[model samples]
Target: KKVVLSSFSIIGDITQNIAKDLVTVTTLVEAGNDSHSYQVTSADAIKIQNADLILCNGLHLEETFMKYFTNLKKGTKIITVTDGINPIGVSEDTDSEPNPHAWMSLTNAMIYIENIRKALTALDPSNAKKYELNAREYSEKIRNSILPLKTRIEKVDPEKRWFVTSEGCLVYLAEDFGFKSLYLWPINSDRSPSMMRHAINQMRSHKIKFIFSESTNSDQPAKQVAYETNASYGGVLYVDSLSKPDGPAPTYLDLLRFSLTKIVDTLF
Candidate 1:
């Protein structure tokens, strides 16, 4: 059986959801770890060494460990799922790379599914039809399931949905779902006092209502920003990883559902 490797758990789930029993899918980074700065184990290296195809988020999301693919034999396939999307950056500066959080938008996720399907079919010709059918079926499920999630978000008054966070991880969400975003850092960098103060200023000036942090990191920064800005400290939102099995966002689709539910709650 051909093996597939994904850069992270969310992508791994998507691969498994589409590929089913046709291929074994594994992830380089387990749930709850930082993808920007990941620690690779020798076992992870070994798996990459053996992988038939690797799906990466790209746009620099897998900076730390992606080099392991360099050690693989020539012609080892690696496909980036975020290709072909018009990406936005933190600012218009030419040096700032586009955001790698494309999976946050189900629209881009459909693109990802398309690319995954194409890559898999190319790799396993006998399974090409199977891959195409599976991809369309799963994408159809997501397409059908996601509109209600966005519709639930639409119920929030347009002006009140400010998506403040520890990092600027939700730009696509802001663009796709109609929310203004404020953040303490451009990417998953260390939080500085000035950055916090700057984010606090933006929230305070705009009268931003609630500040949100996510499952992977400290909510303390968001809590302080809320205290300083006098905004409600809305609780954690899952982004970088799915929640624990018993926790809120236990899967990729549920992650969006749970996140939007929290965002909607905080608005009222």
Candidate 2:
């Protein structure tokens, strides 16, 4: 079987969906871990050496792993899932830097699956039909799952559609569902005082109902925001990482459905 190494678990799940039993899929950053801050080790280097195809979310989502990719053996192919999608800006005002959380949006997730299918098919053409079939079925399932919630979220008052979180990871999702995204920081970096002030002010002005943090980051910041604004500390939002198999967001599909459901419950 062709060996595939994914930068993190979410992409690993998507790749497995496309490759199925035809390929050996392994993840460097496991579920429930922060990929942004991931530190690659010798074992990861070994995995990279063995992989026929290397897949990542790209857009600097796995910035820490770039050195390993740079040193990969010949004949190895590296595919960045976010390659085709036009990335969102780091902030609303400037388009200089990308947000790097593309998979938060279901549309981008479809693109990731497409890229994975193409990569897997090229790596192992014998299973081209299987990959094609699986990609279609998986994309269809994602569409069916999100369509109802997308319609429901759209019906909400546009003014009330604020998605506030610890990291600016949900902007793509916010864009997809026509909601505004506010966060304390972008890409799990240090908290910006101005952004915090802005988030607090917006929450106060708009009466945004809830605030949330991601599975991999501390909830304290969001909890503090909720306290100061008299809003509920909305539960964890899985963006950068998926949960364990027994946890809430084991698969990419589960992540989207769970997150969108949480947003719907909190907002409307």
Candidate 3:
């Protein structure tokens, strides 16, 4: 019997890739859904209750309703992929929670793969070797693919390597690629005229060449910033949620490739 897993969309995508046809993956958030403010539906609760294994980004990144998952079912196997990753602590924003965006770094992603492998093996001892083999192969491919992108990003002029975005979700990626970041607002999702003004001031002073918008976020703020600063605008670069299966960035590697190509194109 296949193990049933309940995961938010982004982790679901990762599991789908690594587990292949070995497990049954059910995602709570749909494509384009913002996990930050996502509310769990009755269906989602039912899915969680029945799941044999639950995988969450954790580090407080889940939708508010998901907090119940912590104690909802004691025996359910819960795995936090962001575990053991060096997370950037949130700065006096949203109660100063730890930044839950660890998957942005390929090195950290290997840690997630290790945790997932351990969980799957423990859950299905019969398939332990298959799980180990698949995890190793997938991790290696991801590591190999990211090396070239990392080199390309390293070649970028350090002074020009600033990231301006509507959300602080890309902190890990920016840090990994040697880029400083300026967000339109504090780490929280609240958007205000004051925040917009602050972003404009940063753009004016830094003359940042591009503003990025995430696939699951509103692009209006980024668009306004681009128009006001005469900077380029691009997005979905940070794949926090899974795309539709047929979408351009359906898988983790697809998202990385799309983001790397866009970043290189716009900045280089």
Candidate 4:
């Protein structure tokens, strides 16, 4: 079987779901790990070198990993699936840097399926029909998931649909789900705060109800914010990575459903 290596666990899930028995999918960053500050072991180096095709999230998402993609063995093909999508940039006012978390939005995730299909097709065109078929089937599943989640999230009275999170990981999701964030920080590298009073202040002033802590990072800061602000902290959200197979967000769809389920129960 051809080996298709992915940037992280979520993309690993996506590639494996689409590739099925055709291509074996391995991930550079394993499940339940942080993507931004992932360490490359010797085993990961071998996987990178041996992969027939390397699938990456790109848009500077995998800085540490991609910095070394060029050092991989010859004949390895790299595809950045986020290409062709009009991306949202970082910072509220300036488009200086694009947000790298495209796959967080299932709407954008359908585009990931298309790009993954296209890459697989171009690399191994003999299996083109099968790949396209798989993409459509899975894309249909992903697209079908939208309305129910939207309907459920929409049921939350718009006035109370505040999605305070561990990080700014949900802006794409927020854009789709219609919630403004009261996050602690923007990215993963930036951490270590005690009071988180600004976030607390926002929650108290805005009457924020739900604080969505992410699974990829420490929830204590958010917990502190919730304690101080007297708000309900929605349990861990799976944004940057998936959980182990036995866990709640083992797959991308599960990630979406798990988050929506939490929102429906707590926020709405």
Candidate 5:
């Protein structure tokens, strides 16, 4: 029989592409749920216990619930996809924790894919060859999709590449893609008119043309900035979760494509 498992949706989505009907997969977070602040229900715990394996994004992104999972079960294998990726150091802006948004960077995500492949193979050794084949094929598709975007982004003027967001989640993406980042507030959800004013000043000083928002945030702040600075507002970018299945960013690659296309269109 195939291994039964639970993964947070974003990782679950990637796993599904490789596992592809070979494993039974269950997702913990629904589309649009913010993993950092998400509350896992009793049903979620039950699912974890039932699964033969549990894959987590790790890197402290799942907030407190991940610790709960760690303590709850000793036998269920829990894999952290960010294992090999060099973590961006936590900032004072982060609430004394490392930023859990590594998926924003394709380089880091590649590490995630490798980790997932390792976990799946170990759990179901009978399917090891099949797992290795599927992982290589899927990784190639991801690489093919990301390489063009990387090339296009490199063409963007270095000074024009700065990104400002409501959250500090984009650090890895900015670092990998050659963009400097400024934010109105720290990593928390709180907002300040003064900080928004500071962002406006930064945009004006740098002549930055666009501001990005995440899928979960209200566009009100970005809209206000654009309106005040007379700058173009780039549409929302997905960070924590993929869009619903029928939405433009349904899959992991689709999400990256949708996001980078928006960034390129706005910045270049």
Candidate 6:
């Protein structure tokens, strides 16, 4: 069987969804861990060296671990799931790298599915038909899941469609659902007093009712923001990675549904 390795758990789930039984899919960054700064191990290097195909979210989402792939053996195919999607800038700087958390949006996931399908089909030409069928089925599940969620979000008042979080991972999600986003920091970086004050001001001025952070991040910053701004610490949102099998967000679809449901339930 062909071996496919994904950069992180979420990408692993998405790739597995499309390549079911056709190949063995493994992830570098496991579930319930932060992909932004995950340290690669020797075992991970061996997997990368031996995998027939590798899938990665190439917008620098896994900057810390991805550097090792530079030494992979020749002809090792690595597919970037975020390819062909126009990315949003992480900051005001025109030179800032595009946000790597593109999987936050289902529409973007559909594009991801397309890219994965193409990659798998290309990798295993003999299984092209099976790959097509599986990708179509998986894409339908994603499409079906997002429709009613979009409808539910549409019912909320336009001004109330605000998503406040610790990281800027939800920018694509907010864009997809017509929501505005405010975060303490764009990525896993330092949080300054000025940044906190600015976030507090935005929360108060926008009348944002809730604040949250990703499952992998420290909620202390979000809690502090909530305290100063008098907003509720809503809860955790799954963004960069999924949870364990028994946890709330074990799969890619489950992560999206769980996060969006929590957002709507809290903010609506």
Candidate topping lDDT: 2
State the number of backbone clashes in model 6: 0
What are the lDDT scores of the predictions, listed in order? 0.80, 0.86, 0.74, 0.79, 0.76, 0.84
Clashes of each: 0, 0, 0, 0, 0, 0
**Tens-digit lDDT string for candidate 5 (6-45):** 4566788888877888888788887877666678888877
Minimum summed lDDT over a 10-residue window in model 6 is located at 90-99
The window of 10 residues in a row where model 1 has the poorest summed lDDT is 90-99
Q: How displaced is residue 29 in candidate 3, in Å?
A: 1.7
Which pairs clash in model 5?
none
What is the TM-score (0 to 1) of candidate 6? 0.94
Q: How close is candidate 5 to the true structure, as a TM-score?
A: 0.89
- TM-score for model 3? 0.88
What value does the lDDT take at residue 42 in candidate 3?
84
Residue range with the least summed lDDT across 10 consecutive positions in model 2: 90-99
Q: What is the lDDT of candidate 4?
A: 0.79
Candidate 4 to truth, TM: 0.91
Question: TM-score per candidate, in order?
Answer: 0.92, 0.95, 0.88, 0.91, 0.89, 0.94
Model 6, 240: alpha-carbon shift in Å? 1.7
Return the number of clashes found in candidate 1.
0
Q: Which stretches of candidate 1 lie over 4 Å from their true place?
A: 92-94
Error of 6 at 105 (Å): 0.4
Alpha-carbon deviation at 256 in model 1, angstroms: 1.5
Best model per TM-score: 2
List residue ranges in candidate 6 displaced over 4 A.
92-94
Winner of 1 and 5 under lDDT: 1
